[PDB]
Design a protein around this ligand. Structure first.
Ligand SMILES: COc1ccc(S(=O)(=O)N(CC(=O)NO)CC(C)C)cc1
Ligand SMILES: [Ca+2]
Ligand SMILES: [Ca+2]
Ligand SMILES: [Ca+2]
Ligand SMILES: [Zn+2]
Ligand SMILES: [Zn+2]
Length: 159
């Protein structure tokens, strides 16, 4: 298995906020995305507002300091680093996308669930029902669930 957090208590911080959405709606999407994974593992997530966090959530465009520049509107939507110090764990969202609460543009919650999966150590899935399948597809958020493959994947890393 690839890198995992060697602890079950994991912190996150939102570095900055997309102007595409209201701040409250970003906070909500991210909280809900962590909750998806917390609900199927022994992992506990704590949001910090200031200071050192394990998982930094970042909205940025183009070349943004890591060796993985974004590519403008479309194409790559987001990427994340597996567990580790510093940039390890961090989840970055391409600001050249239009982030949304809904089925228009790119749904932040669904994208964040996938990215946090990477921040926890998951790779891509070959199951098209898995959130870790590497194509963005809107699905009804109120009825969203991890697939059996996503749960196998994350439980193989933690618990
Ligand atoms: C549901 O969340 C997704 C997040 C990013 C992408 S993506 O298209 O940017 N992409 C990059 C990636 O996997 N980042 O995590 C896949 C791809 C082009 C292989 C697709 C789906
Ligand atoms: Ca980090
Ligand atoms: Ca892009
Ligand atoms: Ca944007
Ligand atoms: Zn990046
Ligand atoms: Zn991915």
């Amino acid at each position: 298995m690839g890198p995992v957090w060697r602890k079950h208590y994991i912190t996150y911080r939102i570095n900055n906020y997309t102007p595409d959405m209201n701040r409250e709606d970003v906070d909500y999407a991210i909280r809900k995305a962590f909750q998806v994974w917390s609900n199927v593992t022994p992992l506990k997530f704590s949001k910090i507002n200031t200071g050192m966090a394990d998982i930094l959530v970042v909205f940025a465009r183009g070349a943004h300091g890591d060796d993985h520049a974004f590519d403008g509107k479309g194409g790559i939507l987001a990427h994340a680093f597996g567990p580790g110090s510093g940039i390890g764990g961090d989840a970055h969202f391409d600001e050249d996308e239009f982030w949304t609460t809904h089925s228009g543009g790119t749904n932040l919650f669904l994208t964040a669930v996938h990215e946090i999966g990477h921040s926890l150590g998951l790779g891509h899935s070959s199951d098209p029902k898995a959130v870790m399948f590497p194509t963005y597809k809107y699905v009804d958020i109120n009825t969203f669930r991890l697939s059996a493959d996503d749960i196998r994947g994350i439980q193989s890393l933690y618990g």
